[PDB]
Design a protein around this ligand. Structure first.
Ligand SMILES: [Mg+2]
Ligand SMILES: [Mg+2]
Ligand SMILES: [Mg+2]
Ligand SMILES: [Mg+2]
Ligand SMILES: [Mg+2]
Ligand SMILES: [Mg+2]
Ligand SMILES: [Mg+2]
Ligand SMILES: [Mg+2]
Ligand SMILES: [Mg+2]
Ligand SMILES: [Mg+2]
Ligand SMILES: [Mg+2]
Ligand SMILES: [Mg+2]
Ligand SMILES: [Mg+2]
Ligand SMILES: [Mg+2]
Lengths: 16, 170, 244, 137, 347, 39
RNA sequence: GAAACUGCGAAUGGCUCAUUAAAUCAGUUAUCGUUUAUUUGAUAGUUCCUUUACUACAUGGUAUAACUGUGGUAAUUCUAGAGCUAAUACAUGCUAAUCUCGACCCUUUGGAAGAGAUGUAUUUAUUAGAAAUGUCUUCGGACUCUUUGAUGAUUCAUAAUAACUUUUCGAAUCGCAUGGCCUUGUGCUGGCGAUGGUUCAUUCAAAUUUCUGCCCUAUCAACUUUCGAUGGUAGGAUAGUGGCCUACCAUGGUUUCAACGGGUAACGGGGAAUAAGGGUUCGAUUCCGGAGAGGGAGCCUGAGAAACGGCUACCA
């Protein structure tokens, strides 16, 4: 039987 | 005081070993329990683990099995007649395994008449020496239990070649 | 010593755990359990150093006592519980199921499985004997005593156990041509098929195993675990299929 | 057989005088394994020996060794001599060494000083004896 | 009385010819106290290994006692049992006496009698008042409760059934051990009327599987000439009931074999009375009628031999003179063909 | 103190014992049927 | 929620290398030679059995601390008398079942008149443990027979019979919650957990143990054996094998292949240094194993100690 298939991203903010 | 370790003894070649370590609890020993005929006195012993041992200081009663008919009856112990290891145990009437003792003939006898209706005939035939013992009123028995460990004096009755040899020794 | 030890130095811990030598002075000591110390992965190591869900011992304790971790279909709260080979670990909150199988390197690998696969496990029949009341029973490699076994089930065979109820669904005999997995020695983690069981009276039996690449190697019988017939394993295998 | 104070018997082997089915006393024996043939003299013998590999309460497990008999002067046990060559790397040369092993022998075997005996390990019979003679040649 | 020292004390104090044993003069005064004390221990419920051993110990000292004292112990068991009204009247059970309590008391009594019989066996002292008539009364009420009681009282019905099973077993035991020695003519009519008579109607369909206490009872009478008058009652009702078991299609070999052995004894045991002649005529014709169907059921060589042994018994006594007896004896014989010297002699 | 909770616990213990006995009997019967099927 | 009882731990960890020369230790074996708290998985309806004259809708002080109060001693983690009160402490003790066949009806989802059978734990003895190539049939199927397992090997596992026991066990424990049946009763039944308990297995361990391997010394050549040295039998002891000890027996056991004795600024090893290679030296010291807690001797507790941040004696 086959194994289970494989399966939050970076976010950016600039201030000042 | 009693210890069993092989260390204090001499080596096979005759060399003497030096004291490797102090005495350990797990190689201990305890005093002998010289069971004797007398009112039942047994005291427990706390041994290694949660287990426990019984010390037969005194017993009169033991369970003796008539093998040739396959029965077992409780019977009073009359006295020690012969022991193969050390004869002072016979003199002091000390009960241990392989001791040769005398037991009452009563329950075995009554069972005999009850089952066989005789004081069919072919089955009732029994070895002559044991019939002589029945007539005497006491039977020779060999202790198969260890009174120093289990607190029992169970044993079995002597028969055949066993019986003949022990009578000859007696 | 005078009694059982309760500490484990990091240098003395099993190598396959991958514990940093400089991180501390002591390593998790696996508590008593189904698997032996050296062949087990305590849950703390699995949750922290492998899955990286927890950052130190204390969040691991928090996770465990939250009852989010299930081993063998049962909730466990001991941080040092000795999970071992072919043990199913379920994290329901994450919807993740793992089966503990060594990689070709010999190290317990994070192998994700489906729920249907997680429903059953495999156990090598270590003993078969009659118990009290004349009831036959089998002892598997994980210490499971299963009563009323199929009388054909013999030592060195493997039994498929349902996790929910713990009965034997099916079994595989130990015969030539079956598919086996190495659970010890330098060949640890390799997969192959039997060629011969070489037998020595009063001595350790030896088994010759041929892999898919036709390479042949010899291993002691204690290190062999049947997992199926050739080309049809009863469990999902890790990446690489136990090659090299 | 009955040369001592106590009675010698195979433990728990019972002879019922009533049935008297056979003249010969009932005798219990076992095969030691490892392809070691139980000698017939043990099968129809009359000796009693608790340390006998075929008739006693002793099992053969562990190492199996071979040796040359060097002494047979005691009762039911012998001393064998095992010789070997030990390698010295500095001089790249062998050195003769030997060791004496005391091994129990059942009376079913007749052993003289000089024959080759194959022996099997068993539980500690005595202070120095840990083997039991299993084959003579 | 002390529990810890109870066992040692019995072996010391009560052993016959014991040094500490009661002196002959002092038995009369001490003994009632001993019996009451031992009676008290005998009611200990056997719910543990120790308790079972204690119940065995109390029964096992009975042989030590003299026979009058043994009879006293058996009396004490039966004193509670109120039976004199039953035998005083025409063997009718009172409705008031029929209660779970009274059944419970008799179940204890029979158990003690069963235990005593196993120990003493042939030496068991049998008396009408002490044991036999309480025993018969117990089997009487077991019959009384079972028929009268409704299905609702399942517990009482089960309890009564156990008393019936033990009582019938208790009878079959006492017949075996002391049947020959004791003279039963006085109580003979009572035993049949109260025990055998009620169950005769269904004795046939009842005992097909294996011998039962009531069936073992009938066989013993068949074997013993003195007790044949049991077989004579009610136009040989018990004799027919035995063959009705044999005549049934589904009687098993375990039940077949004993009865033919019993029937053979009757043929080989002449008795000087008219009833005997009608019996043997009844015994032979019934056993002769169904014999071929029995042989096919027989699966043991010994069972075959005893069948032949009955046939040769028929020929010796001269029943083969009768044409019906002869022609059918052949029919059974050819079934055997379809030991050998026994067959040839018969031919 | 005799309270409803103690009665609950006693009853639950008895129920558990009988349930275990029934389960064991069923298991033994199933094993017997398997053996009968093979023989 | 102080204090105290109860349960668990304190037998791990840390330190040091005094003693120790087939001893420890390294590698490699065995437990069919034995104990094993804890973890994990299994595992226990025995219906009945006279005084039912009956607690199981749940038994006692056969009992005390903490606490109240009266006191001793110069002094200590010293404690005396009196009064109290609890348990998962201590000591006791119960409550209409299941399974074989099954006549007779009925021909199945069958009913059952009745004949029968009934735990563990300890000790001993005994016992078991090894031409149906046909007939019919609906064409399926039915008819008769089988009936322990493992190891190389066992007196193994297991089962059975007869007794036995100052003799055990078989829940008199606790949290959360209030569902389901009704004949409406504080009636019956009922969930999720904790802690206990017999036996087996597993795990952590422990004890012995098979074989090979240690520096200097022969100006140490014979040693061991009277007071066990080698082996046999029986017993005692132990968790258990075993001269481990006891009683009786024999005279054995090692050695120029160096026994025995002496020295060792001798804990052993993984290792470190040097060297082209062979070799030589070091290794208390981060890891494993062994021993010790100023020096001897002996012990309670507990699964586990001959413990010393536990106890008792002797020496300094
Ligand atoms: Mg092996
Ligand atoms: Mg020296
Ligand atoms: Mg050595
Ligand atoms: Mg704990
Ligand atoms: Mg458990
Ligand atoms: Mg007070
Ligand atoms: Mg011995
Ligand atoms: Mg001596
Ligand atoms: Mg030093
Ligand atoms: Mg070092
Ligand atoms: Mg120490
Ligand atoms: Mg100092
Ligand atoms: Mg000390
Ligand atoms: Mg310390």
């Amino acid at each position: 039987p086959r194994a289970a298939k494989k399966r939050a991203k970076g976010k950016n903010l600039s201030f000042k | 005081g009693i210890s069993r370790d092989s260390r204090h003894k001499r080596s096979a070649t005759g060399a003497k070993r030096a004291q490797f370590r102090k005495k350990r609890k797990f190689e201990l020993g305890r005093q002998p329990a010289n069971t004797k005929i007398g009112a039942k006195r047994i005291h427990s012993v706390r041994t290694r683990g949660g287990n426990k041992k019984y010390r037969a200081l005194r017993i009169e009663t033991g369970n003796f099995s008539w093998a040739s008919e396959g029965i077992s009856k409780k019977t009073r112990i009359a006295g020690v007649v012969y022991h193969p290891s050390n004869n002072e145990l016979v003199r002091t009437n000390t009960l241990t395994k392989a001791a040769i003792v005398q037991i009452d003939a009563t329950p075995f006898r009554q069972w005999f008449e009850a089952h066989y209706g005789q004081t069919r005939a072919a089955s009732a035939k029994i070895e002559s020496s044991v019939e002589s013992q029945f007539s005497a009123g006491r039977l020779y028995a060999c202790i198969s239990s260890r009174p120093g460990q289990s607190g029992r004096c169970d044993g079995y009755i002597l028969e055949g070649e066993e019986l003949a040899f022990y009578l000859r020794r007696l | 010593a005078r009694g059982p030890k309760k500490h484990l130095k990091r240098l003395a811990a099993p190598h396959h755990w991958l514990l940093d030598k400089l991180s501390g002075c002591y390593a998790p000591r696996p508590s008593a359990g189904p698997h032996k110390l050296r062949e087990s992965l305590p849950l703390i190591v699995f949750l922290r150093n492998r899955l990286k869900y927890a950052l130190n011992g204390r969040e691991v304790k928090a996770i465990l006592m939250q009852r989010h971790v299930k081993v063998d279909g049962k909730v466990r709260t001991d941080t040092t519980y000795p999970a071992g080979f072919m043990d199913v670990i379920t994290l329901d909150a994450t919807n993740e199921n793992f089966r503990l199988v060594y990689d070709v390197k010999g190290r317990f690998a994070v192998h994700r499985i489906t729920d249907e696969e997680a429903s059953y496990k495999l156990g090598k029949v270590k003993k078969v004997q009659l118990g009290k009341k004349g009831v036959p029973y089998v002892v598997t490699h994980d210490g499971r005593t299963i009563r009323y076994p199929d009388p054909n089930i013999k030592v060195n065979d493997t039994v498929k156990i349902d996790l929910a109820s713990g009965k034997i669904t099916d079994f595989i005999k130990f015969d030539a041509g079956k598919l086996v997995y190495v659970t010890g020695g330098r060949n640890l983690g390799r997969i192959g098929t039997i060629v011969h069981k070489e037998r020595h009276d009063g001595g350790f039996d030896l088994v010759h195993i041929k892999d898919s690449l036709d390479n042949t190697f010899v291993t002691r019988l204690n290190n062999v675990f049947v997992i199926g017939e050739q080309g049809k394993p009863y469990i999902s295998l890790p990446k690489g299929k136990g090659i090299k | 057989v009955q040369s001592e104070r106590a009675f010698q018997k195979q433990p728990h082997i019972f002879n019922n005088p009533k049935v008297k089915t056979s003249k010969r006393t009932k005798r219990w024996y076992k095969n030691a394994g490892l392809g070691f043939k139980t000698p017939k003299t043990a099968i129809e013998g009359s000796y009693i020996d608790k340390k006998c590999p075929f008739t006693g309460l002793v099992s053969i497990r562990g190492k199996i060794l071979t040796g040359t008999v060097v002494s047979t002067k005691m009762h039911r046990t012998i001393v064998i001599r095992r010789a070997y060559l030990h390698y010295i790397p500095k001089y790249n040369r062998y050195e003769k060494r030997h060791k004496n092993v005391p091994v129990h022998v059942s009376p079913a075997f007749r052993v003289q000083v000089g024959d080759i005996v194959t022996v099997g390990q068993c539980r500690p019979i005595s202070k120095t004896v840990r083997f039991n003679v299993v084959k003579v040649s | 009385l002390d529990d810890t020292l109870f066992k040692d004390e019995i072996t010391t104090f009560l052993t016959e010819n014991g040094s500490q044993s009661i002196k002959a003069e002092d038995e009369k005064v001490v003994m009632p106290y001993v019996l009451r004390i031992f009676f008290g221990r005998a009611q200990v419920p056997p719910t543990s290994g120790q308790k079972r051993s204690r119940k065995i110990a109390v029964i096992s000292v009975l042989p030590n006692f003299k026979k009058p004292y043994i009879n006293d112990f058996l009396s004490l068991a039966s004193e509670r049992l109120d039976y004199n009204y039953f035998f005083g009247n025409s063997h009718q059970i009172n409705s008031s006496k029929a209660t779970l309590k009274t059944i419970r008391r008799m179940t204890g009594f029979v158990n003690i009698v069963n235990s005593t019989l196993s120990v003493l066996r042939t030496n068991f002292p049998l008396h009408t008042n002490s044991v036999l008539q309480p025993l018969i009364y117990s089997i009487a009420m077991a019959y009384y409760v079972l028929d009268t009681e409704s299905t609702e009282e399942v517990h009482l019905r089960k309890m009564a059934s156990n008393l019936r099973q033990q009582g019938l077993k208790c009878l079959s035991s006492v017949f075996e051990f002391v049947g020959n020695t004791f003279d039963w003519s006085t109580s003979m009519e009572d035993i049949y009327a109260v025990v055998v008579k009620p169950r005769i109607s269904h004795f046939s369909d009842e005992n097909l599987q294996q011998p039962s206490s009531l069936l073992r009872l009938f066989l013993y009478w068949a074997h013993n000439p003195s007790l044949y008058q049991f077989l004579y009652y009610d136009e040989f009702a018990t004799a027919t009931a035995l063959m009705d078991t044999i005549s049934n299609q589904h009687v098993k070999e375990a039940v077949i074999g004993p009865i033919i052995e019993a029937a053979d004894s009757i043929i080989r045991n002449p008795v000087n009375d008219d009833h005997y002649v009608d019996l043997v005529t009844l015994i032979c014709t019934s056993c002769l009628k169904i014999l071929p169907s029995l042989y096919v059921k027989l699966s043991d060589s010994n069972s075959i031999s005893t069948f032949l042994n009955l046939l040769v018994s028929i020929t010796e006594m001269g029943f083969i003179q009768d044409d019906h007896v002869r022609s059918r004896l052949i029919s059974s014989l050819i079934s055997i063909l379809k030991d050998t010297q026994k067959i040839l002699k018969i031919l | 103190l005799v309270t409803p909770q103690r009665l609950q616990r006693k009853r639950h213990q008895r129920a558990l014992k009988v349930r275990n006995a029934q389960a064991q009997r069923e298991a033994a019967a199933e094993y017997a049927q398997l053996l009968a099927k093979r023989l």
